[PDB]
């Protein structure tokens, strides 16, 4: 599309911000808030509609994991509730295949989900599919050549370098090569033929290391690291470049927005969000109005 939308996030409490960045001119636009604050959600786009999936409302009033699915229409600048998932999913991962949305992992209280479910926008319905071989919260999810990939996370006791791949026509999950680094809460996306895992938390430190998985060779290789360590970051791809938004570096909730150009293997700073925050949902679609 044209704009990078960032929904929700966390700074001292869960947030309801929806803001859109325009890489063409550097400008941010504040849009309609989410009806319910939430961090740890995921964002995605189908048919020019933006979707906020899962998450958790951390608030003074209390803490409520979200099973919600809310759609935003850029034309109207309005949110509508969609059907809820079978179960709340905080620190969720999502991916889109064939106009269908896959919700992966996440926590509900102290439950750490291995379950997965699929939303069909034309019927406004969710259905459970095969569970991952591993429980994963704070899991990175990406789609490549119509296969779904779950990368890293936290299974309840250990944080994971493991990764697995879902094969829809077989309704089956299989392990792939693990990463070289343990990561939970990394930004995971797809560029060209590789799956990128950036940043995250390895149990001790927030990471700035970035690595990528080549589906042909089935290996992970590090690329240039980000200028900032960060976990619970937002990530997306726009015109051949990776954008990472916010996160937590162990000291500050970052407003930094970094851009990776794969041809030069460099990260440059590109803008600041209007305020520091972690755990945002991020997606890309056309301009509002
Ligand atoms: C994403 C993985 N984790 C925790 C789940 C951290 O990186 C982390 C580690 C130590 C302290 C803190 C965090 C963290 C993450 C997101 C928001 C706030 C904090 C925060 O105080």
mmCIF file with all atom_site columns, C-alpha atoms and ligand atoms in Angstrom, residues 10 91 137-138 159 184-186 200-202 204-206 230-233 247-250 253 278-279, ligand 1:
data_model
loop_
_atom_site.group_PDB
_atom_site.id
_atom_site.type_symbol
_atom_site.label_atom_id
_atom_site.label_alt_id
_atom_site.label_comp_id
_atom_site.label_asym_id
_atom_site.label_entity_id
_atom_site.label_seq_id
_atom_site.pdbx_PDB_ins_code
_atom_site.Cartn_x
_atom_site.Cartn_y
_atom_site.Cartn_z
_atom_site.occupancy
_atom_site.B_iso_or_equiv
_atom_site.pdbx_formal_charge
_atom_site.auth_seq_id
_atom_site.auth_comp_id
_atom_site.auth_asym_id
_atom_site.auth_atom_id
_atom_site.pdbx_PDB_model_num
ATOM   1  C CA  . UNK A 1 10  ? 2.317  -0.367  25.859 1.00 0.00 ? 10  UNK A CA  1
ATOM   2  C CA  . UNK A 1 91  ? 1.662  -11.712 22.670 1.00 0.00 ? 91  UNK A CA  1
ATOM   3  C CA  . UNK A 1 137 ? 3.959  -16.743 23.197 1.00 0.00 ? 137 UNK A CA  1
ATOM   4  C CA  . UNK A 1 138 ? 5.798  -13.673 22.019 1.00 0.00 ? 138 UNK A CA  1
ATOM   5  C CA  . UNK A 1 159 ? 12.536 -19.146 25.633 1.00 0.00 ? 159 UNK A CA  1
ATOM   6  C CA  . UNK A 1 184 ? 11.071 -14.094 22.258 1.00 0.00 ? 184 UNK A CA  1
ATOM   7  C CA  . UNK A 1 185 ? 9.237  -10.959 21.188 1.00 0.00 ? 185 UNK A CA  1
ATOM   8  C CA  . UNK A 1 186 ? 11.273 -10.517 18.027 1.00 0.00 ? 186 UNK A CA  1
ATOM   9  C CA  . UNK A 1 200 ? 13.804 -9.882  20.813 1.00 0.00 ? 200 UNK A CA  1
ATOM   10 C CA  . UNK A 1 201 ? 14.732 -11.145 24.266 1.00 0.00 ? 201 UNK A CA  1
ATOM   11 C CA  . UNK A 1 202 ? 17.025 -14.124 24.896 1.00 0.00 ? 202 UNK A CA  1
ATOM   12 C CA  . UNK A 1 204 ? 19.091 -12.115 29.689 1.00 0.00 ? 204 UNK A CA  1
ATOM   13 C CA  . UNK A 1 205 ? 19.370 -9.213  27.219 1.00 0.00 ? 205 UNK A CA  1
ATOM   14 C CA  . UNK A 1 206 ? 17.408 -7.411  24.548 1.00 0.00 ? 206 UNK A CA  1
ATOM   15 C CA  . UNK A 1 230 ? 14.888 -3.959  21.371 1.00 0.00 ? 230 UNK A CA  1
ATOM   16 C CA  . UNK A 1 231 ? 12.226 -6.514  22.274 1.00 0.00 ? 231 UNK A CA  1
ATOM   17 C CA  . UNK A 1 232 ? 8.459  -6.368  21.749 1.00 0.00 ? 232 UNK A CA  1
ATOM   18 C CA  . UNK A 1 233 ? 8.968  -4.388  18.557 1.00 0.00 ? 233 UNK A CA  1
ATOM   19 C CA  . UNK A 1 247 ? 10.121 -1.754  21.489 1.00 0.00 ? 247 UNK A CA  1
ATOM   20 C CA  . UNK A 1 248 ? 11.914 -1.993  24.814 1.00 0.00 ? 248 UNK A CA  1
ATOM   21 C CA  . UNK A 1 249 ? 15.713 -1.892  25.093 1.00 0.00 ? 249 UNK A CA  1
ATOM   22 C CA  . UNK A 1 250 ? 15.970 -2.566  28.836 1.00 0.00 ? 250 UNK A CA  1
ATOM   23 C CA  . UNK A 1 253 ? 10.448 2.431   25.649 1.00 0.00 ? 253 UNK A CA  1
ATOM   24 C CA  . UNK A 1 278 ? 6.351  -1.529  22.930 1.00 0.00 ? 278 UNK A CA  1
ATOM   25 C CA  . UNK A 1 279 ? 4.137  -4.404  21.831 1.00 0.00 ? 279 UNK A CA  1
HETATM 26 C C1  . LIG B 2 .   ? 9.636  -9.355  25.488 1.00 0.00 ? 1   LIG B C1  1
HETATM 27 C C2  . LIG B 2 .   ? 10.397 -10.053 26.592 1.00 0.00 ? 1   LIG B C2  1
HETATM 28 N N1  . LIG B 2 .   ? 10.447 -9.280  27.841 1.00 0.00 ? 1   LIG B N1  1
HETATM 29 C C3  . LIG B 2 .   ? 9.515  -9.648  28.919 1.00 0.00 ? 1   LIG B C3  1
HETATM 30 C C4  . LIG B 2 .   ? 8.301  -10.414 28.445 1.00 0.00 ? 1   LIG B C4  1
HETATM 31 C C5  . LIG B 2 .   ? 11.325 -8.268  27.972 1.00 0.00 ? 1   LIG B C5  1
HETATM 32 O O1  . LIG B 2 .   ? 11.994 -7.864  27.022 1.00 0.00 ? 1   LIG B O1  1
HETATM 33 C C6  . LIG B 2 .   ? 11.488 -7.626  29.314 1.00 0.00 ? 1   LIG B C6  1
HETATM 34 C C7  . LIG B 2 .   ? 12.456 -8.072  30.215 1.00 0.00 ? 1   LIG B C7  1
HETATM 35 C C8  . LIG B 2 .   ? 12.614 -7.463  31.454 1.00 0.00 ? 1   LIG B C8  1
HETATM 36 C C9  . LIG B 2 .   ? 11.817 -6.393  31.830 1.00 0.00 ? 1   LIG B C9  1
HETATM 37 C C10 . LIG B 2 .   ? 10.855 -5.940  30.946 1.00 0.00 ? 1   LIG B C10 1
HETATM 38 C C11 . LIG B 2 .   ? 10.686 -6.552  29.679 1.00 0.00 ? 1   LIG B C11 1
HETATM 39 C C12 . LIG B 2 .   ? 9.601  -5.865  28.966 1.00 0.00 ? 1   LIG B C12 1
HETATM 40 C C13 . LIG B 2 .   ? 9.042  -6.083  27.706 1.00 0.00 ? 1   LIG B C13 1
HETATM 41 C C14 . LIG B 2 .   ? 8.003  -5.263  27.288 1.00 0.00 ? 1   LIG B C14 1
HETATM 42 C C15 . LIG B 2 .   ? 7.525  -4.249  28.105 1.00 0.00 ? 1   LIG B C15 1
HETATM 43 C C16 . LIG B 2 .   ? 8.072  -4.027  29.363 1.00 0.00 ? 1   LIG B C16 1
HETATM 44 C C17 . LIG B 2 .   ? 9.105  -4.843  29.779 1.00 0.00 ? 1   LIG B C17 1
HETATM 45 C C18 . LIG B 2 .   ? 9.866  -4.823  31.064 1.00 0.00 ? 1   LIG B C18 1
HETATM 46 O O2  . LIG B 2 .   ? 9.722  -4.062  31.998 1.00 0.00 ? 1   LIG B O2  1
#
